[PDB]
Structure 1
């Protein structure tokens, strides 16, 4: 409706008997392949991303936002637990880091 791509903002310009809209949009570019999974199996529990998506560069699993590649460590703060690992089709095994663990470790 407001240009090709993900619309950010627009500018109006007057024209003789008309209007010209300059649509400023966000276009994704330089995409890269990753191996993906619906959920992460850890401690008999299924972990799902709160806002992102699980990606793998070949050896390590990360969670990133969907429209830009920004890999982050899969923790309990960006994932939520629902059910066990027996129901989700395509769940893979990976560890889930806990930020609270070094606090009581020390």
Structure 2
């Protein structure tokens, strides 16, 4: 996914959607969770990967 002009990759799991929302879950069991910055890492920009989508990444501490 692409937020703020950057590319975010998952740490452990996959990106799934139920039609209108995006989540993160483990590969062997269905347990949805909300996307924050504590389970993704950023590398590069938004023009190298194929299939990038758009969303918003929750910042857990500073805007709270």
TM-score range, shorter chain: over 0.9
Question: What is the TM-score when the length of structure 2 is the normalising length?
Answer: 0.93
CA deviation map 1:12-45 (0-9, x unaligned) = xxxxxxxxxxxxxxxxxxxxxxxxxxxx100001
Q: Which is bigger in relative contact order (C-alpha 8 A, separation at least 6)?
A: 2
Between Structure 1 and Structure 2, whose CA radius of gyration is higher? 1
When normalised by structure 1's length, the TM-score is 0.58
Q: Report which of the two has the higher share of strand.
A: 1
Which 4+ residue blocks in structure 1 deviate beyond 2 angstroms? none
CA distance in 2, matches of 1:73, 1:83: 23
2:47 to 79, 82, 86: 86
d(CA) in 2 for partners of 1:99 and 1:83?
A: 22
Deviation sequence 1:46-81 (CA, Å, 0-9, x none): 111100111011000001111111111111001110
Task: Count the aligned residue pairs.
Answer: 64
Whole-angstrom distance in 2 between the partners of 1:68 and 1:61: 16
Deviations 1:69-96 (A, max 9, x none): 1111111001110111111100100100
Q: CA deviation at 1:100?
A: 1.2
